[PDB]
Amino acid sequence: MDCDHLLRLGMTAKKILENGKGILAADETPKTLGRRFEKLGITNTEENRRKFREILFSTKGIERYIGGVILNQETFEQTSGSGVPLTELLKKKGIEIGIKLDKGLIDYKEKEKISVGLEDLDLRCKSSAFKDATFAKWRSLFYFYDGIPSEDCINENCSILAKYAIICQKNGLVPIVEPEVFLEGDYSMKRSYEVTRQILSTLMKYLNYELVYIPGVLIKASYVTSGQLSNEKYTPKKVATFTLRALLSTIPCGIPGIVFLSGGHGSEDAIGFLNAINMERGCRTWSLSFSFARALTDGVLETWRGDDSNIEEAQKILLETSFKACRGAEGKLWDQ
Amino acid sequence: MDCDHLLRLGMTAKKILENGKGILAADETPKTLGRRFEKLGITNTEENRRKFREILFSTKGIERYIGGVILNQETFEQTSGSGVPLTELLKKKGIEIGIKLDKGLIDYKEKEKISVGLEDLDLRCKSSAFKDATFAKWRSLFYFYDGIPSEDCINENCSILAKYAIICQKNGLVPIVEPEVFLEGDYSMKRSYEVTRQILSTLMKYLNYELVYIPGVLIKASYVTSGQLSNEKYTPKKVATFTLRALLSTIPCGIPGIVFLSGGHGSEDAIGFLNAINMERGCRTWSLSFSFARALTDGVLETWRGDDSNIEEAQKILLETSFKACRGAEGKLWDQ
Ligand SMILES: [Cl-]
Ligand SMILES: [Cl-]
């Protein structure tokens, strides 16, 4: 953690988000991807998981819009049908390679979760498997119910995210910290707004207590909305207003970027909220961009359907959806 | 706290710091001012306290450099030798009038302090005495010793500052929150840096939990330095680097300004640190300005000495020192 080392982290963080670019999240575990596959009639074979990632990474022109890709650990060991390591597809395109490093969630208190995997995190960061990686991702999830998220759960998850962040940085990796506010729940938008302010301000506390290099951290955040079980409606403008207010209230000038997660929102909504937040006035130093899994790849899966003859059309949908995300990241989706 | 009400707070906060201006702190209690008087041979009469404030507020041209003045409660009841309410001197000059609203400190745990006065704060904000005030100030103080500041003390003081802040805002006053890191102590600059990051990030947590309107809050902060009993040396550049890093790591884009306290540092040092921090590169949305008591008024007291025939020269020193502070607030002290 000398001057040069820190500057490298900051440069990586900015490179990922240059020129309206964002992040393609492709880090689903076999179990998470398998559920997605099964809804659409695709067998959850390793081969189909490998091919899916090949389809994504080999999309021609995707590097104009995508500055980094978050890989699942198993994908680092996989090759294209033509023999080339899947990581090489991305490296040749100049796209930064990331690694998801959490080991999922376990129960905490009543009805809440913490994320796990810190105990061997430093050893894992040093794995030869991930030698080409320059950034990482770790997810916590905040369930909402009557008196929840509890303060204990906010504190513990923020502590875990911060401890992961410092270990990443000490290993030369830019950490993405992902404090996801779970969409499946019954809560008002005002409640999401207030809890988002609690979570993000607390996350910044723990990052500071762990003496994380703030210019070398990316925050992957949920949009501020009401819960999916709420009867409450909202529009892109309202999501933009509330989300940007929460961020302006909580995120220090030194953070280089916020990258939104799609979170169960539609592709259309996720991109529209991004565009809307980037048209909002309100001085800020950080980029507002994207780290989408479903918003970018649901259409690819729905087009592909496990049939090689649908691959070209699936790649076209990725490229077009990635274009729109990038235009949204600059607030230009209505233009040209 | 409707839209218009909030916008007024933000406008006040920006007006105070327009055009490189800063804050003249004149809010010393009779006891605090009296100690200063007695060192220099001036009797601690109410008359001498009144005259001192008249000397300050009637300084010709001071409004070019001073955007607001923090008054002590007793000063709102006082008049010039010519009969004019002291607040009228400032109002006629277009300078914002502030009120210090804390009731001082009491013991907390072992060797620490909390600030007090919340219980009647709302009633006091509504006093007809303060009807011309548009902003307020509240001070906490953090002593440093082996395992101190304790986490309990950081949390409690930040909670108190945030509770004061929200009450101010609900009464139409912009709160200045002052988490002063006490200079008298034995600690390294690295320790001050790390603890400053703890305190400021925690203060932002509590401001967010109290749902304070962040664009309507000013932070009056200590420079990051080693303690006065430390043998450790530092220069303006090092103070600038460490202080700006701490601020970039902790203070959200929405905060309109940071105003440094002089804190026992010399006038010369306090202004020099300000200039140095304003020459630092590093993108930020907030102003870096001043809220000085001693740095601006020690020279006035030392020149005046309680003799009317020294008043003109005392006012000249205030104006010249205020000029330098303002040039420092723009990073221009070496120029023109
Ligand atoms: Cl997953
Ligand atoms: Cl005082």
Residue numbers in the entry:
A (entry chain A), B (entry chain A): 2 to 337
Show sentences the authors wrote.
Here, we present two crystal structures of the class I fructose bisphosphate aldolase enzyme from E. cuniculi: one with the reactant bound at the active site and the other with the partial substrate mimic phosphate. For the phosphate-bound form, a data set was collected to 2.00 Å resolution. The space group was also C2221 and the unit-cell parameters were a = 121.96, b = 137.61, c = 62.23 Å. Similarly, there is clear electron density for the phosphate group in the 2.00 Å phosphate-bound structure. The purified enzyme crystallized in 90 mM Bis-Tris propane pH 6.5, 18% PEG 3350, 18 mM NaKHPO4, 10 mM urea for the phosphate-bound form and 100 mM Bis-Tris propane pH 6.5, 20% PEG 3350, 20 mM fructose 1,6-­bisphosphate for the FBP-bound form.
